[PDB]
Symmetry: C3
Subunit: 112 residues, 3 copies
Protein backbone atom coordinates (compact mmCIF):
# COMPACT_ATOMS: atom_id res chain seq x y z
CA UNK A 1 0.00 0.00 0.00
CA UNK A 2 0.86 3.71 0.01
CA UNK A 3 -0.04 6.01 2.94
CA UNK A 4 0.50 9.74 2.43
CA UNK A 5 0.22 11.86 5.59
CA UNK A 6 -0.48 15.59 5.17
CA UNK A 7 -0.53 17.60 8.38
CA UNK A 8 -0.51 21.36 8.92
CA UNK A 9 1.79 21.01 11.96
CA UNK A 10 5.50 20.26 11.99
CA UNK A 11 6.53 16.61 12.22
CA UNK A 12 9.79 15.55 13.86
CA UNK A 13 11.66 12.30 13.78
CA UNK A 14 9.77 10.85 16.73
CA UNK A 15 6.35 11.50 15.24
CA UNK A 16 7.35 10.16 11.83
CA UNK A 17 8.75 6.96 13.30
CA UNK A 18 5.74 6.44 15.61
CA UNK A 19 3.28 6.94 12.75
CA UNK A 20 5.34 4.61 10.53
CA UNK A 21 5.05 1.90 13.20
CA UNK A 22 1.28 2.40 13.37
CA UNK A 23 0.97 2.22 9.58
CA UNK A 24 3.12 -0.92 9.41
CA UNK A 25 0.96 -2.57 12.05
CA UNK A 26 -2.28 -1.54 10.30
CA UNK A 27 -0.96 -2.92 7.01
CA UNK A 28 -0.14 -6.28 8.60
CA UNK A 29 -2.99 -6.67 11.11
CA UNK A 30 -5.89 -4.95 9.33
CA UNK A 31 -5.08 -5.04 5.65
CA UNK A 32 -3.40 -8.49 5.82
CA UNK A 33 -0.44 -7.31 3.67
CA UNK A 34 3.33 -7.34 4.26
CA UNK A 35 4.29 -4.46 6.57
CA UNK A 36 7.54 -3.89 4.63
CA UNK A 37 5.43 -3.08 1.51
CA UNK A 38 3.60 -0.02 2.84
CA UNK A 39 5.36 3.05 1.40
CA UNK A 40 4.82 6.07 3.58
CA UNK A 41 5.31 9.75 2.80
CA UNK A 42 5.11 12.60 5.29
CA UNK A 43 4.19 16.15 4.32
CA UNK A 44 4.37 18.44 7.35
CA UNK A 45 3.72 22.13 7.86
CA UNK A 46 1.31 21.95 4.93
CA UNK A 47 -0.76 25.15 4.61
CA UNK A 48 -4.31 23.87 4.98
CA UNK A 49 -7.80 25.24 5.43
CA UNK A 50 -10.78 23.33 6.81
CA UNK A 51 -13.93 24.11 8.75
CA UNK A 52 -13.14 27.88 8.48
CA UNK A 53 -9.62 27.86 9.82
CA UNK A 54 -5.99 27.02 9.28
CA UNK A 55 -5.74 25.37 12.71
CA UNK A 56 -4.07 21.94 13.12
CA UNK A 57 -5.58 19.55 10.59
CA UNK A 58 -4.67 16.33 8.83
CA UNK A 59 -5.47 14.47 5.60
CA UNK A 60 -4.25 10.88 5.34
CA UNK A 61 -4.54 9.16 1.97
CA UNK A 62 -4.49 5.37 1.80
CA UNK A 63 -3.95 3.58 -1.53
CA UNK A 64 -4.13 -0.20 -1.87
CA UNK A 65 -4.19 -2.29 -5.01
CA UNK A 66 -7.25 -4.57 -4.83
CA UNK A 67 -9.18 -2.27 -2.46
CA UNK A 68 -10.31 -3.18 1.03
CA UNK A 69 -12.17 -5.93 2.87
CA UNK A 70 -15.60 -5.05 4.30
CA UNK A 71 -14.54 -4.06 7.83
CA UNK A 72 -11.06 -2.78 7.02
CA UNK A 73 -11.71 0.94 6.24
CA UNK A 74 -13.65 1.42 9.50
CA UNK A 75 -10.78 -0.10 11.45
CA UNK A 76 -8.06 1.85 9.59
CA UNK A 77 -9.97 5.13 10.09
CA UNK A 78 -10.29 4.49 13.81
CA UNK A 79 -6.63 3.55 14.25
CA UNK A 80 -5.16 6.26 12.04
CA UNK A 81 -7.36 9.00 13.54
CA UNK A 82 -6.37 8.01 17.09
CA UNK A 83 -2.68 7.86 16.10
CA UNK A 84 -2.68 11.30 14.47
CA UNK A 85 -4.37 12.77 17.55
CA UNK A 86 -1.86 10.99 19.81
CA UNK A 87 1.26 11.96 17.84
CA UNK A 88 0.30 15.39 16.50
CA UNK A 89 -2.39 16.65 18.87
CA UNK A 90 -4.80 17.20 15.98
CA UNK A 91 -8.37 16.69 17.05
CA UNK A 92 -10.49 13.94 15.45
CA UNK A 93 -12.92 16.36 13.82
CA UNK A 94 -9.97 17.89 11.96
CA UNK A 95 -8.76 14.51 10.51
CA UNK A 96 -9.79 13.08 7.14
CA UNK A 97 -8.76 9.62 6.00
CA UNK A 98 -9.35 8.95 2.28
CA UNK A 99 -9.18 5.55 0.58
CA UNK A 100 -8.28 4.78 -3.00
CA UNK A 101 -7.25 1.85 -5.10
CA UNK A 102 -4.80 2.24 -7.99
CA UNK A 103 -5.47 0.36 -11.21
CA UNK A 104 -1.92 -0.90 -11.31
CA UNK A 105 1.17 -0.81 -9.09
CA UNK A 106 4.78 -1.44 -10.00
CA UNK A 107 7.55 -2.43 -7.55
CA UNK A 108 11.07 -3.58 -8.38
CA UNK A 109 10.34 -2.85 -12.06
CA UNK A 110 7.30 -5.13 -12.44
CA UNK A 111 3.57 -4.75 -11.82
CA UNK A 112 1.63 -6.77 -9.24
Amino acid sequence: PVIQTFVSTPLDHHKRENLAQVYRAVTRDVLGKPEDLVMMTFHDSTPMHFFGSTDPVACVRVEALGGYGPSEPEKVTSIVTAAITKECGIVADRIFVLYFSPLHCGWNGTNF
Copy 2:
Protein backbone atom coordinates in the same frame (compact mmCIF):
# COMPACT_ATOMS: atom_id res chain seq x y z
CA PRO B 1 -14.41 16.99 -0.41
CA VAL B 2 -10.63 17.46 -0.63
CA ILE B 3 -9.03 20.06 -2.94
CA GLN B 4 -5.25 19.93 -3.30
CA THR B 5 -3.69 22.94 -5.07
CA PHE B 6 -0.22 22.52 -6.60
CA VAL B 7 1.27 25.64 -8.12
CA SER B 8 4.82 26.34 -9.29
CA THR B 9 4.64 29.94 -7.98
CA PRO B 10 4.82 31.11 -4.38
CA LEU B 11 1.53 31.47 -2.51
CA ASP B 12 1.08 34.00 0.29
CA HIS B 13 -1.58 34.36 2.91
CA HIS B 14 -3.82 36.48 0.70
CA LYS B 15 -3.82 34.02 -2.17
CA ARG B 16 -4.42 31.04 0.10
CA GLU B 17 -7.35 32.71 1.83
CA ASN B 18 -8.89 33.92 -1.46
CA LEU B 19 -8.62 30.45 -3.02
CA ALA B 20 -10.07 28.89 0.15
CA GLN B 21 -13.10 31.18 -0.16
CA VAL B 22 -13.56 30.18 -3.80
CA TYR B 23 -13.30 26.48 -2.93
CA ARG B 24 -15.78 26.85 -0.05
CA ALA B 25 -18.23 28.58 -2.36
CA VAL B 26 -17.80 25.94 -5.09
CA THR B 27 -18.38 23.17 -2.55
CA ARG B 28 -21.61 24.77 -1.35
CA ASP B 29 -23.01 26.23 -4.59
CA VAL B 30 -21.83 23.71 -7.20
CA LEU B 31 -21.23 20.47 -5.35
CA GLY B 32 -24.16 21.00 -2.93
CA LYS B 33 -22.02 19.96 0.09
CA PRO B 34 -21.21 21.72 3.39
CA GLU B 35 -18.52 24.35 2.81
CA ASP B 36 -16.93 23.57 6.21
CA LEU B 37 -16.25 19.99 4.97
CA VAL B 38 -13.93 20.82 2.07
CA MET B 39 -10.36 20.17 3.26
CA MET B 40 -7.87 22.21 1.31
CA THR B 41 -4.12 21.81 0.99
CA PHE B 42 -1.76 24.26 -0.70
CA HIS B 43 1.56 23.22 -2.22
CA ASP B 44 3.41 26.26 -3.56
CA SER B 45 6.73 26.73 -5.32
CA THR B 46 6.35 23.18 -6.62
CA PRO B 47 8.98 22.38 -9.29
CA MET B 48 6.83 21.54 -12.30
CA HIS B 49 7.24 20.93 -16.00
CA PHE B 50 4.50 21.19 -18.62
CA PHE B 51 4.23 22.07 -22.29
CA GLY B 52 8.07 22.25 -22.52
CA SER B 53 8.74 24.63 -19.67
CA THR B 54 8.88 25.23 -15.96
CA ASP B 55 6.90 28.48 -16.29
CA PRO B 56 3.96 29.22 -13.94
CA VAL B 57 1.63 26.23 -13.94
CA ALA B 58 -1.01 24.69 -11.71
CA CYS B 59 -2.57 21.29 -11.00
CA VAL B 60 -5.69 21.24 -8.82
CA ARG B 61 -6.97 17.87 -7.64
CA VAL B 62 -10.57 17.54 -6.52
CA GLU B 63 -11.72 14.47 -4.55
CA ALA B 64 -15.36 13.90 -3.60
CA LEU B 65 -16.96 10.81 -2.16
CA GLY B 66 -19.92 9.88 -4.40
CA GLY B 67 -18.49 11.64 -7.49
CA TYR B 68 -20.10 14.53 -9.30
CA GLY B 69 -23.44 15.55 -10.79
CA PRO B 70 -23.61 15.86 -14.60
CA SER B 71 -22.87 19.59 -14.93
CA GLU B 72 -20.69 19.99 -11.85
CA PRO B 73 -17.17 19.23 -13.23
CA GLU B 74 -17.61 21.73 -16.09
CA LYS B 75 -18.63 24.41 -13.62
CA VAL B 76 -15.85 23.60 -11.11
CA THR B 77 -13.23 23.64 -13.90
CA SER B 78 -14.41 27.03 -15.10
CA ILE B 79 -14.49 28.56 -11.62
CA VAL B 80 -11.23 27.07 -10.37
CA THR B 81 -9.33 27.93 -13.57
CA ALA B 82 -10.52 31.55 -13.43
CA ALA B 83 -9.64 31.78 -9.72
CA ILE B 84 -6.11 30.40 -10.17
CA THR B 85 -5.51 32.86 -13.02
CA LYS B 86 -6.92 35.71 -10.90
CA GLU B 87 -4.97 34.88 -7.73
CA CYS B 88 -1.72 33.49 -9.14
CA GLY B 89 -1.48 34.94 -12.65
CA ILE B 90 -1.15 31.46 -14.16
CA VAL B 91 -2.65 31.32 -17.61
CA ALA B 92 -5.60 28.99 -18.34
CA ASP B 93 -3.64 26.80 -20.74
CA ARG B 94 -1.21 26.05 -17.91
CA ILE B 95 -3.98 24.89 -15.46
CA PHE B 96 -5.16 21.30 -15.03
CA VAL B 97 -8.08 20.37 -12.81
CA LEU B 98 -8.38 16.63 -12.08
CA TYR B 99 -11.37 14.91 -10.51
CA PHE B 100 -11.43 11.76 -8.42
CA SER B 101 -13.72 9.95 -6.06
CA PRO B 102 -12.36 8.01 -3.08
CA LEU B 103 -13.91 4.66 -2.24
CA HIS B 104 -14.24 5.63 1.38
CA CYS B 105 -13.70 8.71 3.54
CA GLY B 106 -13.31 8.97 7.29
CA TRP B 107 -13.92 12.11 9.38
CA ASN B 108 -14.06 12.39 13.17
CA GLY B 109 -13.04 8.71 13.37
CA THR B 110 -15.92 7.26 11.31
CA ASN B 111 -16.54 6.69 7.61
CA PHE B 112 -19.29 8.42 5.63
Copy 3:
Protein backbone atom coordinates in the same frame (compact mmCIF):
# COMPACT_ATOMS: atom_id res chain seq x y z
CA PRO C 1 -1.52 12.88 -18.11
CA VAL C 2 -0.12 13.89 -14.72
CA ILE C 3 3.07 12.34 -13.28
CA GLN C 4 3.92 13.20 -9.67
CA THR C 5 7.42 12.17 -8.55
CA PHE C 6 8.06 11.80 -4.80
CA VAL C 7 11.62 10.98 -3.83
CA SER C 8 13.31 11.04 -0.43
CA THR C 9 16.55 12.41 -1.95
CA PRO C 10 17.24 15.93 -3.16
CA LEU C 11 16.54 16.68 -6.82
CA ASP C 12 18.50 19.31 -8.74
CA HIS C 13 17.85 20.97 -12.04
CA HIS C 14 19.63 18.27 -14.02
CA LYS C 15 17.65 15.43 -12.52
CA ARG C 16 14.34 17.24 -12.93
CA GLU C 17 15.01 18.03 -16.57
CA ASN C 18 16.23 14.49 -17.35
CA LEU C 19 13.17 12.92 -15.70
CA ALA C 20 10.90 15.38 -17.53
CA GLN C 21 12.41 14.24 -20.85
CA VAL C 22 11.81 10.60 -19.93
CA TYR C 23 8.21 11.32 -18.94
CA ARG C 24 7.57 13.28 -22.15
CA ALA C 25 8.95 10.40 -24.20
CA VAL C 26 6.88 7.82 -22.29
CA THR C 27 3.74 9.91 -22.81
CA ARG C 28 4.34 10.09 -26.56
CA ASP C 29 5.83 6.66 -27.29
CA VAL C 30 4.04 4.44 -24.76
CA LEU C 31 0.83 6.21 -23.87
CA GLY C 32 0.30 7.61 -27.41
CA LYS C 33 -0.58 11.09 -26.05
CA PRO C 34 0.87 14.56 -26.75
CA GLU C 35 4.13 15.00 -24.83
CA ASP C 36 3.32 18.68 -24.15
CA LEU C 37 0.21 17.54 -22.19
CA VAL C 38 1.95 15.57 -19.44
CA MET C 39 2.04 17.80 -16.34
CA MET C 40 4.86 16.85 -14.05
CA THR C 41 5.42 17.71 -10.40
CA PHE C 42 8.57 16.99 -8.41
CA HIS C 43 8.58 16.54 -4.64
CA ASP C 44 12.13 16.01 -3.38
CA SER C 45 13.61 15.43 0.05
CA THR C 46 10.28 13.90 1.05
CA PRO C 47 10.50 12.16 4.46
CA MET C 48 9.57 8.58 3.60
CA HIS C 49 9.58 5.18 5.23
CA PHE C 50 9.51 1.84 3.41
CA PHE C 51 10.78 -1.67 4.00
CA GLY C 52 11.91 -0.66 7.54
CA SER C 53 13.99 2.37 6.67
CA THR C 54 14.11 5.96 5.55
CA ASP C 55 16.79 5.18 2.95
CA PRO C 56 16.48 6.51 -0.64
CA VAL C 57 13.04 5.62 -1.96
CA ALA C 58 10.62 6.81 -4.62
CA CYS C 59 6.88 6.83 -5.33
CA VAL C 60 5.79 7.90 -8.81
CA ARG C 61 2.09 8.44 -9.42
CA VAL C 62 0.75 8.34 -12.96
CA GLU C 63 -2.74 9.69 -13.75
CA ALA C 64 -4.30 9.41 -17.21
CA LEU C 65 -7.85 10.11 -18.26
CA GLY C 66 -9.16 7.00 -20.06
CA GLY C 67 -6.72 4.62 -18.33
CA TYR C 68 -4.09 2.54 -20.06
CA GLY C 69 -3.72 0.11 -22.97
CA PRO C 70 -2.96 -3.53 -22.09
CA SER C 71 0.84 -3.43 -22.33
CA GLU C 72 1.35 0.21 -21.34
CA PRO C 73 1.66 -0.02 -17.50
CA GLU C 74 4.33 -2.75 -17.75
CA LYS C 75 6.33 -0.60 -20.14
CA VAL C 76 5.90 2.63 -18.10
CA THR C 77 6.94 0.82 -14.89
CA SER C 78 10.07 -0.53 -16.54
CA ILE C 79 11.07 2.82 -18.05
CA VAL C 80 10.26 4.96 -15.03
CA THR C 81 11.96 2.58 -12.58
CA ALA C 82 15.14 2.52 -14.69
CA ALA C 83 15.08 6.32 -15.03
CA ILE C 84 14.68 6.94 -11.29
CA THR C 85 17.56 4.56 -10.58
CA LYS C 86 19.68 6.26 -13.26
CA GLU C 87 18.93 9.84 -12.17
CA CYS C 88 18.57 9.46 -8.41
CA GLY C 89 20.48 6.29 -7.56
CA ILE C 90 17.42 4.79 -5.87
CA VAL C 91 17.37 1.04 -6.19
CA ALA C 92 14.53 -0.70 -8.05
CA ASP C 93 13.21 -2.47 -4.96
CA ARG C 94 12.70 0.95 -3.36
CA ILE C 95 10.59 2.34 -6.29
CA PHE C 96 6.80 2.19 -6.52
CA VAL C 97 4.90 3.31 -9.60
CA LEU C 98 1.14 3.73 -9.07
CA TYR C 99 -1.45 4.18 -11.81
CA PHE C 100 -4.76 5.98 -11.62
CA SER C 101 -7.37 7.39 -13.91
CA PRO C 102 -9.30 10.55 -13.02
CA LEU C 103 -13.01 10.68 -13.77
CA HIS C 104 -12.64 14.06 -15.40
CA CYS C 105 -9.83 16.43 -16.37
CA GLY C 106 -9.98 20.12 -17.18
CA TRP C 107 -7.38 22.07 -19.20
CA ASN C 108 -7.65 25.62 -20.51
CA GLY C 109 -10.97 25.95 -18.65
CA THR C 110 -12.78 23.02 -20.29
CA ASN C 111 -12.99 19.29 -19.62
CA PHE C 112 -11.74 16.62 -22.03
